Amino acid sequence: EVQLVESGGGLVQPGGSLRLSCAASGFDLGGYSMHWVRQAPGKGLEWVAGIYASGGATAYADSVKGRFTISADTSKNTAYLQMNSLRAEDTAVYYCARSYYYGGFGMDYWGQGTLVTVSSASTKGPSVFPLAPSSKSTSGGTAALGCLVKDYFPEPVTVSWNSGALTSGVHTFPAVLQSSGLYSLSSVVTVPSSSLGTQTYICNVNHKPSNTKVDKKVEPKSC
């Protein structure tokens, strides 16, 4: 059974460096080309570098030349990516993947990805801003309440309603990064409209990286 496992991601501030490792099992390294690929959040895949295990020769993407170094070790049956002089621009989910010879072949086995997040704001707990429902007639007789979960760092934040009891009718955004250096995501609950004055609707935003949570009650407002 062929498996590869990536590790070593984390949060490193601008001007620093980060080492990623990937180990193989079920097959050898010799005769194979090991590659690293990055995926900035919200973006597609970008190739970084490749090394031929039985060569020692490498190839790099133009966008990473002078900053990203690739290497491999056949005694260990592992491979590494050395990223130097890191910037906020380097935020990405990093992946290891394998190919053949020195190229001419695409990647076959892929890792799941390890996220490193860098911005001007190294960490913050979230806060929540409520959004009032429509007070007018709607299609289907339904209505919704929502909130904006704002200014936290790093992502992920798990969002649910009624302190985590309400998942039914819950829809949330992937977070995006703002000018503040912090992340934000919207969240809503859709129910038959009479339920908005009956059920409890408290946004529960869970942010493990800061050891905090926000419990914010969202309710109908007069208008």
Partner 1 sequence: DIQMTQSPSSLSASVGDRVTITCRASQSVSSAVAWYQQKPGKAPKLLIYSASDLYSGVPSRFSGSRSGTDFTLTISSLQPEDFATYYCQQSHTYPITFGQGTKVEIKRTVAAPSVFIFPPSDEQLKSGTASVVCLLNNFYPREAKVQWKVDNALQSGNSQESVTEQDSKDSTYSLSSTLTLSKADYEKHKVYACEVTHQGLSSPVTKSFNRGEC
Sheet holding 212-217, edge to edge: 158-160, 202-207, 212-217
Work out the burial of residue 104: count CB atoms within 10 Å of its CB; fewer than 13 is exposed, 13-18 middle, 19 or more buried.
Answer: exposed
Which CB atom, from 108 or from 122, has the smaller least distance to partner 1? 108
| Contacts to partner 1 from residues 184-203, by CB under 8 A | 185-186, 188, 190
Binding residue (CB under 8 A) for partner 1 from 103, 168, 208, 219: 103
Q: Applying CB under 8 A, which part among 11-19, 55-63, 80-88, 202-210 lies near partner 1?
A: 55-63
**What is the pairing mode between strands 202-207 and 158-160?**
antiparallel
Q: Which two tokens stand for residue 46?
A: 């970008």
CA distance readout (Å), 46 to 96, 127, 128: 12, 34, 34
Contact 96, 70 (CB under 8 A): no
Q: Of 9-17, 81-89, 120-128, 170-178, which segment contacts partner 1 by CB under 8 A?
A: 170-178
What is the rounded distance in angstroms from the CA atom of residue 2 to the CA atom of residue 111?
Answer: 11
Residues 25 to 54 in contact with partner 1, rule: CB under 8 A: 35, 37, 44-47, 50
- CB closer to partner 1, 75 vs 198: 198
Q: Are strands 46-52 and 32-39 parallel, antiparallel or unpaired?
A: antiparallel
Distance (Å, whole) CA 108 – CA 34: 11
Nearest approach in angstroms of CB 217 to partner 1 is 14
Residue 148 interacts with partner 1 (CB under 8 A): yes or no: yes
Q: Is 86 or 191 the residue whose CB approaches partner 1 more closely?
A: 191
62 belongs to the binding site for partner 1 (CB under 8 A) = yes
Radius of gyration of the chain (CA): 23
The least CB distance from residue 19 to partner 1, in Å, is 20
Judged by CB under 8 A, how many residues of this single chain contact partner 1?
56
The site for partner 1 (CB under 8 A) is made up of 2, 35, 37, 44-47, 50, 59-63, 93, 95, 99-100, 103-113, 129, 131-136, 138-140, 142-144, 146, 148, 169, 171-174, 176, 185-186, 188, 190, 221-223
